[PDB]
């Protein structure tokens, strides 16, 4: 029990976490999280040669965001915390990184043409 | 002929000599990690510099719209009858008027001099 | 396998509060650190800078253990916030904000140096070898 | 739908569309409208406030206005001055300048009292005639004659004390790029250079060399190890080894340093060359002692230790490569670029890439009236803020109060610009010895073709008597952008030059919208990548700054070119180079590059079908012109750098016929090869039949013919 | 023809690529005369 | 320039006007006394005998190997001649240096100057000292190699960097 003491539990549990990049306007929508903090629902479809993840906004939060999965290779990532009681804790190791993007961002099609 | 990096501090391993078993040992000068040498040669200096640029030219040069083309010399590895040729365009230009070719067929990239 | 034919749907929440700030602790893969070898760790802000900005000092295994220095990344939410997504017993997902990015690197405890003496050393070396010439 | 052998009347109907819209002095009129809409608002907006002090005060500037040129009569009644009275009464054609200032007093006296004085007078700026801010903008010939003005007068000059002054475009070496030369007289065997300037915000431009000492250094010591890579940073006296300045940024280890400089460890020939660079820098093996080493020799030798470690901190942070980033964060970028600068110096020593050319016209930029008056306006706005303090402190120590309308010395900006323009020396009045002379000479009004040939003239700032021929001889890259025949004799042969008929100089834009597209098209940033995934990737530069990598360059290049073809998202004046061999991609957006239009060619046929001609000969009552021709992807502006990755055909009906042919992958085609001549050299009949020096004499002789 | 050989006569006229190379030759021939005068004048003044 | 290299005209004049130490192309014209002035072969031999020739002009490549014993012969095929020397073993006075230097020569550049490694072998010894020791092949073998070790009297400052210094010093200061 000391201030500079770091909890290693998460790591030693091999606890995994997911990492997702989110646009600010969506994140600004999320600061207005519905209810306790709910923002919506995540949908995951995996097939024999294709895997699809997306998130859909809460109907309340509204008043499809597909995910792009990103590699975490080349650099080991873990999450470590600082409590409001300044206690330190390692929650886990990052097992996934991702970046949701708005669907059909205008022309792209024109720039392909 | 290559180079050796330390396995602890990731630095350059120097060659050293031990007076016990007459074997080359590679040592570090930050830590003292050790190991023996497999080829037992250190320095080589090529003065002829007769490196054939067939090992330096890239296969995507056949996408250049400013290079001459030929219907005479076909490719051997694929049989395509269109090539694109050029000169050394590098140093060692004393007697350098050879003519390297590159096949223009997509996904062949075969290169050859003559 | 389920990674191929696997399907599912889970709820996502983003709580407006947390009991602890969330940061990222990044390691070079090239080191392939065995976290199992970490019996204990100490974690303190670096003392060279003599708080929230302070680089971290990580000391593995209490007394006898490894040591790393963590340096803060330039930005973390300059254009896009980073979230920690965690699976809950109810299957629903929980998202946690990333407060900061710290870069952790390994430290060389041996090989101490003093450039004052080494400056004179290089000059002497650049002199003795230059002498006794021809 | 194709145009067979009706070509001789078709090429002269698109050229007519060009000049009916652009004109001949759009060179001058477009750089001015830029300096006065954007480049002047940014200078006052990006200026440090003057917090000063007990209470303390605030002052910051918000918005700039202008009014139409006006003359104040003898009894103080204003009236708009027409350009003719300015010539008759020896007046000056200028416009007054205002600003909004807000003043908040901060004394924590339980209240923050703020107040503002909007539209405060500052000074007067000259106005280039026929601009968007002149009294003659957008008038019809019935009104131009009513003010006693000529409808054929081109415009593009100032009226200063009755006279008519014209600004000469000055040449200048390109910035934010790496050049490798070889001084065969001094101690160095090779040298690199990079002049950096952080987006039009710095009065100086910090330059940094990365040298390499000579091989034949007579001395048994250095005979065995070899040459040592050295660096000559700014604001320091002594040379510095590169490994030292590398460690001052962190990166003390020698496995991490030697991955910013060498991108693949299967190359023993290069690693052998960098080995004797560590031996002498195996001295400062930690950060703080390294900062002391460079911090020991500055403009001030530090007596204490903390000041040197402080002094070495910013000089390595705000004077080293300011174009990459000037913030104290993001110092991994200053390491990669400094590594690329050294990785490129070794390639020039192993003989794997050729040295750069000094006079290659793709390494030059041009300073029009825009980037010249903006440089002169900074040094006089700082000088106006430096003397509001001196008036505030003297006036606030007595603690009375403050009044700002009496602090602004209005004669600073008015007489500052008007002086240097009228006399030419590009400096200050007490600085009639430190300035660049020869700019801003008097317009030539001998004959109408001597007027046009004056508003289109370049000038290389090298000396006027140096006997070195290489800055005087004709470069081949001058094809189509500078007239080859027109030049004066005497001592100024080849130093002043006139630009060709269709040559167009760019005006500049912001790289913001391309960067936001690049990141969403699968471009890995520099930070979040491993230095081993860099050997088979094409480093992507933008405007001089390394901003990522990409494992699929060609599709991006064609897509970008295609986007540029419609200029759909890209200002049609950006150039996008891709060199297959060196495996990188460059993009430019700045001002000063010189362009010229060409005809885009698909597989082997032109993209200009007959449908474009029979509707282009009708511009009078159809509203279809040059602009609707660029926006349809049939012509395209081609810079000088981009002109090395292209394959041109001179004439359609003769070079694009399938046969036993020269080439078969033509990418562009010329409009008419007669547009490679200047203004005074395109009035000669059959000049393709004369000896060459004869065409030079007449072009310098039809400028003094009475008419 | 690709490196400077002009094969026409002044009566039959030159093609554009030949008109450019001719201009280059003329330009160098024009610079040398501009140098020569100053050089010779100064050296003669010294000697005399 | 329209005329190898000779300076004429007004720059040659002011090279004569002053007697500045630096002519832009100093050159001594030479004439030949005997039948050597008649036949091209003796002219060419005195030509080669006058021209300066260093070592790096007659070498193909060099390599620093490591033979702790002269019978180790790390490279595969040099064992024959080094061995036929080894059955006549001389100069094992103090030690045998484990560090070796191996040099390859180009007979093209060798014969054009009428050189063969015998004279080189004595002068690379006679002229530098006796700290070096040269054994060599027979020229009937196509490739001309000669191997050198330091004189072992020094082994009873590192010898590797010293050997690299000597290698980088002899190919430019040869004076053949
Ligand atoms: Zn080591
Ligand atoms: Zn093929």
Short mmCIF file of N, CA and C in Angstrom, two decimals, chain D residues 145 147-148 421 430 442 563 565 606 653:
data_model
loop_
_atom_site.label_atom_id
_atom_site.label_comp_id
_atom_site.label_asym_id
_atom_site.label_seq_id
_atom_site.Cartn_x
_atom_site.Cartn_y
_atom_site.Cartn_z
N UNK D 145 -13.43 55.79 -70.67
CA UNK D 145 -13.12 56.96 -71.47
C UNK D 145 -13.64 58.24 -70.82
N UNK D 147 -13.47 59.03 -67.65
CA UNK D 147 -12.47 59.49 -66.69
C UNK D 147 -11.13 59.78 -67.33
N UNK D 148 -11.08 59.85 -68.66
CA UNK D 148 -9.84 60.09 -69.40
C UNK D 148 -8.81 59.00 -69.12
N UNK D 421 9.24 51.70 -52.00
CA UNK D 421 8.73 51.59 -53.36
C UNK D 421 9.26 52.68 -54.26
N UNK D 430 16.89 54.56 -42.55
CA UNK D 430 18.19 54.50 -41.91
C UNK D 430 18.96 53.25 -42.31
N UNK D 442 10.94 52.44 -62.90
CA UNK D 442 9.88 53.25 -63.51
C UNK D 442 9.40 52.59 -64.79
N UNK D 563 -8.01 13.54 -60.08
CA UNK D 563 -8.75 14.53 -59.27
C UNK D 563 -8.32 15.90 -59.77
N UNK D 565 -7.31 16.54 -62.68
CA UNK D 565 -7.76 16.75 -64.07
C UNK D 565 -9.06 17.56 -64.02
N UNK D 606 -6.34 12.26 -78.42
CA UNK D 606 -6.58 13.45 -77.62
C UNK D 606 -7.93 13.33 -76.91
N UNK D 653 -1.67 15.37 -85.14
CA UNK D 653 -1.86 14.66 -86.40
C UNK D 653 -0.60 13.98 -86.91
#
